[PDB]
Amino acid sequence: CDLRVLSKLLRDSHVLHSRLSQCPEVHPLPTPVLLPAVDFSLGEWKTQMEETKAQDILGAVTLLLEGVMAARGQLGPTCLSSLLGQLSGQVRLLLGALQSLLGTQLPPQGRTTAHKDPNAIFLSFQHLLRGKVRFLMLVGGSTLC
């Protein structure tokens, strides 16, 4: 396959986020939920070994998928939860690509912020896909897939 699993993955992702205005009465989570830190200062993160960087991410997509599920699990059978859900679909492609490359699953891990705002969960996803992931799709790659 491609280094475009990232691109069609990023594509598919605005499209769902966009749809969060079709949903009447969207309420900021009744419980703050952890998410894979939206930090834009990854110069030092670049120096670390080829696998490590990938291992930090696997750990960070696991926490994300874990975040989606927990906020979708403070919430009933709605429209948010319904959408906050094919998002889980998208997260899972990423998780499978990284687990496969790495030959293992890893634990939930890394620096976090908490969010009641559903929007910012739809966001750490797009943000991971744009940084940590991207700066580790550009160095040729042991493919990504």
Epitope: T52, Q55, L93, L95, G96, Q99, G103, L106, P107
Partner: antibody, heavy 116, light 107 residues
């Protein structure tokens, strides 16, 4: 929160057959890779088998000392994983454990005695 | 068929003593993983990815090494630390473990 309960162990005679079950709760089971790991005073901890998730195509791997004899499977719908054991040898004796998410979660273990 | 070997097979120590256990690998591996096990209960993840402590694991522990040689150090150990520790590698299949270091206490 996340729990795994083996059942199905106890006595089986050499050359018998026995099926282990493992019930998961409290996380999305079809998202988990699962593994079977057995223990005895002599051999120590020995990995037996791994079965991957739906997204990881359900890839299977076996310990060499077990090929032809043990089969592993899962039922996502049922949140469960299994170890179908055949032509059991005395050396298969030991506590057997399901482990979930690549050795992050561990059941309580079941004791498998192969004797006549 | 990567073979793992753990040094002092057994050892004792006192609270406030530095402890250092070694895992040697038969060929090069990118990471080591560790597990702790106390009698009559199940192994638990202790250290993964060489140097990351597991949920539940105190800051007095540190994992390190690379290639062919790794280790688990406790800076100043505590009674609750007495157990068997196993290294495990994941560079392919089979998965193999080392045969344990029993860390017991002296009194």
């Amino acid at each position: 929160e996340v729990k795994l309960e083996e059942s199905g162990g106890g006595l089986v005679q050499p050359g018998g057959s026995m099926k282990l079950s493992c019930a998961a709760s409290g996380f999305t089971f079809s998202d988990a890779w699962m593994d079977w790991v057995r223990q005895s005073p002599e051999k120590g901890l020995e990995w037996v088998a791994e079965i991957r998730s739906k997204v990881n195509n359900h890839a299977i791997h076996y310990a060499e000392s077990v090929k032809g004899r043990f089969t592993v499977s899962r039922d996502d719908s049922k949140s469960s994983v299994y170890l179908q054991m055949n032509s059991l040898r005395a050396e298969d004796t030991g506590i057997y454990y399901c482990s979930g998410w690549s050795f992050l979660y561990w059941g309580q273990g079941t004791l498998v005695t192969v004797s006549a | 068929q990567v073979v793992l070997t753990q040094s002092p097979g057994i050892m004792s120590a006192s609270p406030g003593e530095k402890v250092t256990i070694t895992c040697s690998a038969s060929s090069s591996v990118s990471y080591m993983y560790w597990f702790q096990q106390k009698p009559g209960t199940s192994p638990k993840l202790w250290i993964y990815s060489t140097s990351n402590l597991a949920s539940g694991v105190p800051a007095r522990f540190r994992g390190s090494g690379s290639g062919t040689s790794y280790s688990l150090t406790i800076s100043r150990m505590e009674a609750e630390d007495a157990a068997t520790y196993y290294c495990q590698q994941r560079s392919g299949y089979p998965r193999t473990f080392g045969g344990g270091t029993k860390l017991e206490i002296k009194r």
